[PDB]
């Protein structure tokens, strides 16, 4: 008797899925839509270099840190790598004022660019360029900030200064005031018990009134010097009044804003010669997944932060391998050129023969749906400036609830879209391998027998042009009727 | 040969949908998901008129800028409608304090009354009702904001006030605190090197020394008079105690807190007549529609914003249109008054017929569904209260990292719905065309023969009647068994 | 004519659920994965404690307000527990720095001991332990704070402290700075009109200059004492140097940090004796369904605040039974009498009639629906929820900004929750469609054209199919050549009659 089977693809994958339904499926083929790398590795972001700060801390760097290298030329950076204990930060003691607000400004630059803003030789009557043993060139010299003018010897005597922002770009520029330890000590550095000044940018006005008070010994200072900053816009004019107790902003910055902030990545790390599309302090995410589970804060074009350990999407069929049976027993191990199809057996010969078209077909639906689940992680540019200051814990503790919120949301979400895309993948398969078998089914009608294995009796003979008609479907049920109904008389009645 | 066939409807639509398995699939019908309408119009809020400042910013209408409009009778607002850029702020210069928290208290407001709250005339041996040209009415005049009455000639002298709040309402007082540029310009206005103020509200102290200080020459002005507010609650007591350089809350605002913050629409477009319940800066959006892609901020009842360019729902059928075959090929552009329905053949005639109850049924589901992704969209009141002082630029990234968050979520997951839903939609619509088909196969059974193009070969005569039981369900398959095996037995042989 | 149907379980059961496609389809069986229950329980967090404040405020707690309870022995606790409206708050009228940032802090705690830090008669030419009729123990008397040592009559004299934490955990310090009215009262305090205090802890200086200023009367009181706090960590240093008007940190507290930050519960109610993974101010959340209604604010191990009314799946069947007498399958509706499985069979033959479970297909479905809704439930797999999410009173801008995030997450929950149980509801019900109509196509490819789909979910077999033929049909082992010859002759009588 000649056969048809309807049957599909198995293999020698160990690879299995999850589903709403069912647990560990064996499958032919998967797909992860988590990236889960670490490299270690920190690269530039989208081709664009990020600022190494070596051993130097933002604030010295920016002062200019006599440990720490000038900046020369012209620059700009996607981000600003720091390590996470600077050998050189701060040298002479104070606190530096809203330093969370300037890295929103300067994490991200396209023109970074010192330039002299004051000439401090203007001033008479006063000492300039002074020095101090607790900001050294090296071991044991005495030096200062490169870019703030420690003014001494003041008398009392009122400096005035203006300056006017001709420029097409913002100018940043940092100050510092000394608060003095005692009355002995403001006269020996200014001569006279006065010393306030104010700096005005635009608008707006800073005052810093003269303040003496013993603090504790930090750096081999009891007394301290507090830094301050502002932003001169473009054709806005500052000035400073001071009668002492200034440290003048010599040197600025002008730089050119960027949209898309990023921030600060704390590593010991080096910077290495690589390229990413989103980095963490961990190692690169050079992927463009839809999910990770490496960190929970990064920059730039970005997967979603999940606590997932997988996410496998099923692409392929269940792995369940069995005159041969068809789909209703399992899989054909020899079925090797596509997803679903026939075996066959007539006089001339057997063998397996792939759908191609039904096939193809369901790879098109597959990898539209696995790349729909991908592309359509359309991101906003991913942050990692997510610092307040130290009296601020409770806004912390909101930008931590915030993240731990849409934590929960994309780890659930994500792990449930998986769950249930892989039902409906297993169930997809299933529709089209019956799609074939009900197509073959009608076809040969009451001229064959359903053996109810997924297997056809064919009750004629049907040669391999036979065979090629109902799987093209164009096989004729009158052709072979009178054939057909002769057999079955004979199996009436055996 | 009498035949009845299966199928469904096709007509003109050019639209298309995208799932997740197929994209640009032609239906006869789909429905967006997504408010995309831009219209510019500044309306009413649920039938609730907002405040239209004209040419004056919040701080100078509130205390009363000469050149701003006079609250005249109590009033309301569903929000704030300011100029970008207002032509009237505040004219003597000096900052207003905590103009963010103010915002969420008098942005949405149910009553709104100014009222006098003291009787400057009962303070001796001082000047009240002071001006200064830098207030005028128009060019050259010399006036002062009509709710702070500047007093002056203190002379050291102690003022003493007290004040109950003994309606139901909180009331809102503005004052301000007089910053001096010299002692001489001090002596000028109090004749005295004292004044300090402290203002009492409820429990709470606020106590403002006498602060001498030049500050920049900003509107002919090198002194500051800064700006401070305060609510007294319904019973709540509140006092002053100064002896100079204050501007005293001469007047104030009673007014009913409402439950939702909406905030300040910033446009130069006038109030028109429309009434929409959410309300943008760039226009209206009057729409139930669970999303929109028009703006970020927004206030009321809105859609969730999202970046997609289009979310369309299928609800009608593939449009892929085909003696006439039945679904298999394709659907019926003759079909015009159904979804899903037949078409017969026979001696009396034909014709196409709609399954009334198969389209009522799928109607409803897919009503049902549209509805469902509709209508579960209900949110809580959106707000555009997203402003910090100027020092918290750090809040506001994490204000606007938030948004972002969100809108990431909205966008992948009404993204992802649509697709799945699309898919689903289709597979429903074909599961209905079977359902029809199962039902007449298994009547007819082997009274007929099945063509495989969704139509039946009839092995009898059937009339209308016949036809008619069939697609009613009530066809007899023994009434023509004799009649159609006689036919079949011609066709076991020819 | 001998009969083998395929149907499905109905019960009595009057539970209904909503799909994307229908609403309120009766079902035989469903589950819910909402929490509603309000019981208004303080219980213990995870088997731990929370510190009950009793009728006091926390800062009146910490700083050891006379009429509330000293802690006498080192302690833990999960979360704090605060009435509404403590009777016992800060008895000498002034601001209590920073107490939003201290919750962070001391909300969870593993150990916590009070100690002496200062041995307050160091210092000469000083008055301590002073007491104010504002801070009685009772009726009529004067006290103070236990742990607070004000220390008057300085004269201008310069206290100096340094002190280092030697200890294996934070300790937290707690301190007060007097503002008098009036230079009278400078005077009759300190004897000078001097009085300032520098305190450091670690490298962070705080300086507390001499304020002198009228204020209105509280609790008798013109003048103001504010206080502050700090943590000095393991082997952290800190120093005093106060020339008056300092009330001194003599005693304070270690205390050990812990990971997940709950916050305050306020409530009038007491600690009950029970234990929940989640609690709220309203009652105890003891549940790890993924959902609740009852309280946007809650501590530990919670479901996603939902707006929903209700979140119920669907488990069961469709429960649309069908109304001796002949009996039709699952075309028609349910069998209220299939008591022993989802799907099955009902057979009529010479032998009699009945009902049969289809035991495998039954056990399939009920583990893959299982499954299912463990999935859903067990996959909301959460971060530590806190309570902690309050602001100053002059930061009402950042407090909104906190109540439009959760607003936020509020309606991304509710909308993803509620079309998770619509979309799984339509698919649980077509799920029952399809394993129905799976047992319906395995009989009729066994049966072929011995027997004749009446249409109805039913077989009229055209041979004697005995118990043991029956059998075979629902065992998959019907042989159809066995019965050939006798169906055709059947055939043969229906193809004329
Ligand atoms: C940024 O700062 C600059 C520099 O000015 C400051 O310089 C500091 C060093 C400090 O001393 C500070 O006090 C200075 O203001 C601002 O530009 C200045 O603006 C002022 C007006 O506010 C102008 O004053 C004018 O001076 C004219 C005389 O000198 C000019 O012309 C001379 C030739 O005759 C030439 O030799 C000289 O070098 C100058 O070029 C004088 O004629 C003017 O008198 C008229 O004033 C008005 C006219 O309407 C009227 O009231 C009066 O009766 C007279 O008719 C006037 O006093 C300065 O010239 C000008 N300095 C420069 C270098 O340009 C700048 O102000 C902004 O730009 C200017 C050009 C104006 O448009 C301002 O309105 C504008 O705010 C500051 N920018 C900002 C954003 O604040
Ligand atoms: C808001 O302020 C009002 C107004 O009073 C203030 O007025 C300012 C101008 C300023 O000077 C401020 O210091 C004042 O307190 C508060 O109401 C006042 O409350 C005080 C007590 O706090 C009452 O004082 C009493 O006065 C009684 C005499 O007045 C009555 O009789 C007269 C009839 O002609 C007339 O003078 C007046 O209209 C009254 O009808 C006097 O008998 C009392 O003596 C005994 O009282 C207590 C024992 O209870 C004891 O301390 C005292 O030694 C005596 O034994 C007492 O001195 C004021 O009468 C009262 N003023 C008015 C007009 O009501 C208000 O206080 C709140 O309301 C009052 C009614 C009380 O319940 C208070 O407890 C409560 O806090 C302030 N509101 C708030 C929330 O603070
Ligand atoms: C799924 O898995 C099975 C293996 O578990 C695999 O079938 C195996 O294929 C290998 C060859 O790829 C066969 O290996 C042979 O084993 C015989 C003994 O049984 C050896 O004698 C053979 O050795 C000769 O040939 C080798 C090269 O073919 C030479 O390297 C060697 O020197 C000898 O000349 C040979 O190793 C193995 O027998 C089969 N097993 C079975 C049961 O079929 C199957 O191919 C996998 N499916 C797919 C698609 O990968
Ligand atoms: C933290 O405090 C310790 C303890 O010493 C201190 O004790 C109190 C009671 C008071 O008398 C202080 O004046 C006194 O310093 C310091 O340890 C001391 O170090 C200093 C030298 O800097 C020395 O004078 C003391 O003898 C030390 N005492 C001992 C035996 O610990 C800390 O000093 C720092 O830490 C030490 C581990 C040491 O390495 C020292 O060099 C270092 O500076 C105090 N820390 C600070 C910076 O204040
Ligand atoms: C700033 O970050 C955004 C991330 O949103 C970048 O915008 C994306 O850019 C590419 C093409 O320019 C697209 O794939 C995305 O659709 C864009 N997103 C949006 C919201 O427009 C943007 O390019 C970044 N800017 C720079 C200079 O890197
Ligand atoms: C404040 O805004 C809320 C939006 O959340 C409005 O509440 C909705 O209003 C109607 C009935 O008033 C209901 O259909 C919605 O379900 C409500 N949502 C909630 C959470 O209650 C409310 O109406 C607004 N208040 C006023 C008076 O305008
Ligand atoms: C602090 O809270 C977290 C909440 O996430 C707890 O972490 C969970 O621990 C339980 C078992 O203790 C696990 O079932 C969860 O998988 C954990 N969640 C995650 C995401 O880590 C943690 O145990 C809590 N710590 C203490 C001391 O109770
Ligand atoms: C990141 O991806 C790009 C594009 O695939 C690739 O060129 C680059 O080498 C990748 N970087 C790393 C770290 O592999
Ligand atoms: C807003 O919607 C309502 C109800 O659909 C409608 O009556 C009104 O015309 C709309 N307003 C605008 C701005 O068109
Ligand atoms: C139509 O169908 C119903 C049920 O299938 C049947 O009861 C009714 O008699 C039919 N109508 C006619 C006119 O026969
Ligand atoms: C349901 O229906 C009737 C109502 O009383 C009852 O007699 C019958 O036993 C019930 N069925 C079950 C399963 O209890
Ligand atoms: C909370 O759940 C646990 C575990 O199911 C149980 O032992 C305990 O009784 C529950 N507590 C409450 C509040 O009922
Ligand atoms: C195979 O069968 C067909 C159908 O009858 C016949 O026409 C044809 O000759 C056969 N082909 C071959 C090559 O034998
Ligand atoms: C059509 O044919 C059927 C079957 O013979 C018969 O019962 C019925 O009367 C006929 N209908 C009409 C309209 O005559
Ligand atoms: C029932 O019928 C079968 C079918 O031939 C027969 O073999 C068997 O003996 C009968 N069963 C019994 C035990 O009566
Ligand atoms: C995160 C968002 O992505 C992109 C930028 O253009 C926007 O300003 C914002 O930074
Ligand atoms: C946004 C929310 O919607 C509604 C209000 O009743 C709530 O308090 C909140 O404003
Ligand atoms: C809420 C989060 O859940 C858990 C902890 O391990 C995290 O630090 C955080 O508390």
Known sequence: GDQICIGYHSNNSTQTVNTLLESNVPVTSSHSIL?????????????????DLIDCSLPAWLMGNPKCDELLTASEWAYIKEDPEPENGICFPGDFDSLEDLILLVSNTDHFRKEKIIDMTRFSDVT???????????????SFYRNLN????????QLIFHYQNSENNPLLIIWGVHQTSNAAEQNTYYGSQTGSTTITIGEETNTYPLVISESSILNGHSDRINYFWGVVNPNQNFSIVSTGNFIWPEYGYFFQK?????????????????????QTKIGAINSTLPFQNIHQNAIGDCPKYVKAQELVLATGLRNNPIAIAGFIE????????????????????????????????????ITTKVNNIIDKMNTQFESTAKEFNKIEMRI???????????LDVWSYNAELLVLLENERTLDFHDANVNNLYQKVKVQLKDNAIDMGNGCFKILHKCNNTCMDDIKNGTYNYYEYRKESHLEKQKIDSG
Chains 1, 2 share one sequence.
Do not use: M
Request: glycine fraction near 12%.
């Open 258 to 278: 960027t949209t898309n902030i990023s921030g600060i990545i704390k590593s010991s790390e080096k910077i290495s010669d690589c390229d990413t599309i989103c």
């Open 396 to 406: 912390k503790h909101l930008s931590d609830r915030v993240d731990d919120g849409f």
């Open 35 to 51: 990236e889960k790398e670490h490299n270690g590795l920190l690269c530039k972001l989208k081709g664009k270099a990020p600022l």
């Open 330 to 365: 399992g899989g054909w191990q020899g079925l090797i050129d596509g997803w679903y199809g026939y075996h066959h057996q007539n006089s001339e010969g057997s063998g397996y023969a792939a759908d191609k078209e039904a096939t193809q077909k369901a790879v098109d639906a």
């Open 150 to 157: 420690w003014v001494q010897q003041n008398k009392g005597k």
């Open 128 to 142: 300039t360029n002074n020095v101090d043993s607790a900001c050294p060139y090296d071991t044991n010299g005495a």
